[PDB]
Design an enzyme around this catalytic site. Structure first.
Site, PDB file in Angstrom:
ATOM      1  N   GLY A  22       0.822  -1.193   0.000  1.00  0.00           N
ATOM      2  CA  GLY A  22       0.000   0.000   0.000  1.00  0.00           C
ATOM      3  C   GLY A  22       0.857   1.242   0.000  1.00  0.00           C
ATOM      4  N   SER A  63       1.613   8.634   2.973  1.00  0.00           N
ATOM      5  CA  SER A  63       1.689  10.067   2.722  1.00  0.00           C
ATOM      6  C   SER A  63       2.937  10.477   1.952  1.00  0.00           C
ATOM      7  CB  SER A  63       1.639  10.839   4.045  1.00  0.00           C
ATOM      8  OG  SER A  63       2.785  10.571   4.836  1.00  0.00           O
ATOM      9  N   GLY A 100       5.121   7.635   0.140  1.00  0.00           N
ATOM     10  CA  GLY A 100       5.748   6.508  -0.526  1.00  0.00           C
ATOM     11  C   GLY A 100       4.777   5.357  -0.656  1.00  0.00           C
ATOM     12  N   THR A 101       5.252   4.298  -1.309  1.00  0.00           N
ATOM     13  CA  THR A 101       4.469   3.087  -1.531  1.00  0.00           C
ATOM     14  C   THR A 101       5.285   1.896  -1.054  1.00  0.00           C
ATOM     15  OG1 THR A 101       3.364   4.084  -3.442  1.00  0.00           O
ATOM     16  CG2 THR A 101       3.238   1.689  -3.213  1.00  0.00           C
ATOM     17  N   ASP A 138       5.801  12.053  12.377  1.00  0.00           N
ATOM     18  CA  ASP A 138       4.566  11.406  11.935  1.00  0.00           C
ATOM     19  C   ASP A 138       4.186  10.261  12.869  1.00  0.00           C
ATOM     20  OD1 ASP A 138       5.852  12.603   9.289  1.00  0.00           O
ATOM     21  OD2 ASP A 138       3.701  12.383   8.908  1.00  0.00           O
TER      22      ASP A 138
END
Ligand SMILES: CNS(=O)(=O)Nc1nccc(Cc2c(C)c3ccc(Oc4ncccc4F)cc3oc2=O)c1F
Ligand SMILES: Nc1ncnc2c1ncn2[C@@H]1O[C@H](COP(=O)(O)OP(=O)(O)NP(=O)(O)O)[C@@H](O)[C@H]1O
Ligand SMILES: Nc1ncnc2c1ncn2[C@@H]1O[C@H](COP(=O)(O)OP(=O)(O)NP(=O)(O)O)[C@@H](O)[C@H]1O
Ligand SMILES: [Mg+2]
Ligand SMILES: [Mg+2]
Ligand code: NI
EC number: 2.7.11.1
Lengths: 260, 322
Positions: A14, A17, A19-20, A122
């Site tokens: 998935g 915010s 990257g993948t 984060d």
């Protein structure tokens, strides 16, 4: 830097915010995040300097950081579920002392990162994993060069410190802003819910939290949540950042209430 | 459904097109993930991503939006059930609906394909959109908002250029409105954006209604008219540098709430158009014009009578063959 030849990108997990995430193999199970960033040469050097700091981190409650590729980052793969899924998707049956233990281990990993002069930026339940049962693992810490330079907020609104929302000064990030985000994680643990359940408007949340018009409803904390833990949630999410405790004091307070 | 078409005041071609779309919906049963063949990406955003797909059983070209959400299975099933109301949202100014399902952790929403894309994409190619085109856009948005209010007792909640879609037949339709209360709640847990079309009363958390969508339309009309997101307003020099002789998100929200609304520049636009968007951007929603007053405004009455080849303008602008 890691050789892309040795990186065996397997399945896609998935995107977040910045990257993948892909599962991979690099001398073992590894996680690879294809960053959404063509980087500027000044940013590429700031990235390489951050990676040198993050690679040296060594703590039981911190996910291992391997390196970078060419842009992508390689981190320790975690086969457990994130804290967000346990609390809000699976609704895992947690005892009260287990919730306090998750709060303690998260404070230990944060105390280590801050003592190593690393701001998470984060902190949220999505970036906390439960490893082999009840061992907290913190990920996606730092990476200010790839998450953002532009003095604009980036990340999830619910955990964002009010001074980070406002971005009045170019750098509103500090140890205290991580403590606010940690406080929202405490709110998740001690309520089973997200804050502002009565507000279904993202822009309304950004504005009201920034102005100080909205704060987490502390009446929704569990009735069997100890008074010291209730006060800890209130102290971590103080609107004025100078009134928030730091993780040395947070960890001591948890250790005090835990040993009753 | 075909009976509900008679309740709408349509011209003959609008009725034929809706009846044709309702006929194609009969060729669609259950929607499974393995029945779609990707063709191309159409765009992405904060919530999810959109693909142009081919539904192999029916042969219909569809737009498939995938929204990724980490929610309880009960909330997910309630979202799928609430989205079924879209089966009854049939109007010339509303994007059609085919079905919704869950797979791979993604809620898929299959809807009518609009080969013209959004006005956000059209604006990036045109630079600015002519006033006479925006007159037809305003009529479509007002009538679409009126349809949702009267026929379904809901407001849009997210009016903006990216949620106004167009096609090669000259149609202008609304999309991405709040039909599922659980989907609105779930998407409130989002990442920070870079700009906003939210009304001042919704930002402040006071009472709101379709008046908020009217504000969003007014702000959207200014952006497409000047070719730039209008918060903060441009300088007078910037106006001549656009028609001829950056704030962070919280600062934008504070500007929307505490500063006067933007306005169109005078001279380059008609006085009727300037007054129209001014009545849309009145900060007090009780003083702001409503759907009934906007439809009989001088700008709309003039635009409604004008003959405008919108499909031809789209073809000459984005290359969309009729
Ligand atoms: C910024 N304003 S806000 O903060 O209020 N957020 C929200 N605003 C508005 C709505 C929602 C949720 C939502 C979404 C996003 C949605 C998207 C597509 C959809 O498919 C079709 N749509 C129209 C026509 C045909 C279709 F096939 C249905 C949807 O239904 C929904 O309910 C929000 F979260
Ligand atoms: N180290 C990891 N090991 C295993 N799964 C991971 C790891 N990091 C991320 N994931 C998963 O990969 C998916 C996307 O991760 P990510 O890009 O971090 O999204 P996010 O954490 O929710 N938002 P953010 O971290 O702020 O960018 C989620 O399902 C995560 O649980
Ligand atoms: N039915 C459709 N037919 C054709 N194109 C579409 C359709 N729906 C969406 N698109 C396109 O796909 C893009 C992605 O839409 P979306 O995921 O809603 O993000 P967005 O609305 O553009 N921005 P945001 O609302 O902030 O996430 C849109 O901008 C349109 O150009
Ligand atoms: Mg993460
Ligand atoms: Mg949209
Ligand atoms: Ni102890």
């Amino acid at each position: 830097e890691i050789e892309a030849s040795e990186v065996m990108l397997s399945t896609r997990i998935g995107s977040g915010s910045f990257g993948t995430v892909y599962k991979g193999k690099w001398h073992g199970d590894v996680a690879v995040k294809i960053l959404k960033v063509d980087p500027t040469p000044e940013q590429f050097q700031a990235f390489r300097n951050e990676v040198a700091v993050l690679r040296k981190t060594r703590h039981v409650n911190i996910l291992l950081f391997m390196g970078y590729m060419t842009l992508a980052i390689v981190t320790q793969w975690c086969e457990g579920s994130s804290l967000y899924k346990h609390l809000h998707v699976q609704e895992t049956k947690f005892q009260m002392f287990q919730l306090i233990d998750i709060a303690r281990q998260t404070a230990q990993g944060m105390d280590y990162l801050h003592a190593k002069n690393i701001i998470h930026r984060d902190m949220k339940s999505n970036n906390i994993f439960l490893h082999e049962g009840l061992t907290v693992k913190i990920g996606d810490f730092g990476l200010a060069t790839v998450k953002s330079q532009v003095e604009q907020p980036t990340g999830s609104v619910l955990w964002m410190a009010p001074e980070v929302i406002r971005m009045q000064d170019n750098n509103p990030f500090s140890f205290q802003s991580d403590v606010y985000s940690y406080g929202i994680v405490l709110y998740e643990l001690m309520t089973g819910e997200l804050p502002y359940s009565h507000i279904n408007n993202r822009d309304q949340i950004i504005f009201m939290v920034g102005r100080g018009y909205a704060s987490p409803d502390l009446s929704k904390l569990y009735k069997n949540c100890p008074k010291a833990m209730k006060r800890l949630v209130a102290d971590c999410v103080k609107k004025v950042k100078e009134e928030r405790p730091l993780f040395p004091q947070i960890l001591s307070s948890i250790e005090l209430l835990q040993h009753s | 459904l075909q009976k509900k078409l008679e309740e709408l005041e349509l011209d003959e071609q609008q009725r034929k097109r809706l009846e044709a779309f309702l006929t194609q919906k009969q060729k669609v049963g259950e929607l499974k993930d393995d029945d779609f063949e990707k063709i191309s990406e159409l765009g992405a955003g904060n919530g999810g991503v959109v693909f142009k797909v081919s539904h192999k059983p029916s042969g219909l070209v569809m737009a498939r939006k995938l929204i990724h959400l980490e929610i309880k299975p009960a909330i997910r099933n309630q979202i799928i059930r609430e989205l079924q109301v879209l089966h009854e949202c049939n109007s010339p100014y509303i994007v059609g609906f085919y079905g919704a399902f869950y797979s791979d952790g993604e809620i898929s929403i299959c809807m009518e394909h609009m080969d013209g894309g959004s006005l956000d994409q059209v604006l990036k190619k045109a630079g600015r959109i002519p006033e006479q085109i925006l007159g037809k856009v305003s009529i479509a948005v007002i009538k679409g908002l009126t349809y949702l209010r009267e026929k379904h007792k809901i407001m849009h909640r997210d009016v903006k250029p990216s949620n106004i879609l167009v096609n090669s037949r000259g149609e202008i339709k609304l999309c991405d409105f709040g039909v599922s209360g659980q989907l609105i709640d779930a998407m409130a847990n989002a990442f920070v954006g870079t700009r906003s079309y939210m009304s001042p009363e919704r930002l402040q958390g006071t009472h709101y209604s379709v008046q908020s969508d009217i504000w969003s339309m007014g702000l959207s009309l200014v952006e497409m008219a000047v070719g730039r997101y209008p918060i903060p307003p441009p300088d007078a020099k910037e106006l001549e540098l656009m028609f001829g002789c950056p704030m962070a998100i919280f600062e934008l929200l504070d500007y929307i709430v505490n500063e006067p609304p933007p306005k169109l520049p005078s001279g380059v636009f008609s006085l009727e158009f300037q007054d129209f968007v001014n009545k849309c951007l009145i900060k007090n929603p009780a003083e702001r014009a409503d759907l009934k007053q906007l439809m009989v405004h001088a700008f709309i009455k003039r635009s409604d009578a004008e003959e405008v080849d919108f499909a031809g303008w789209l073809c000459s602008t984005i290359g969309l063959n009729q």
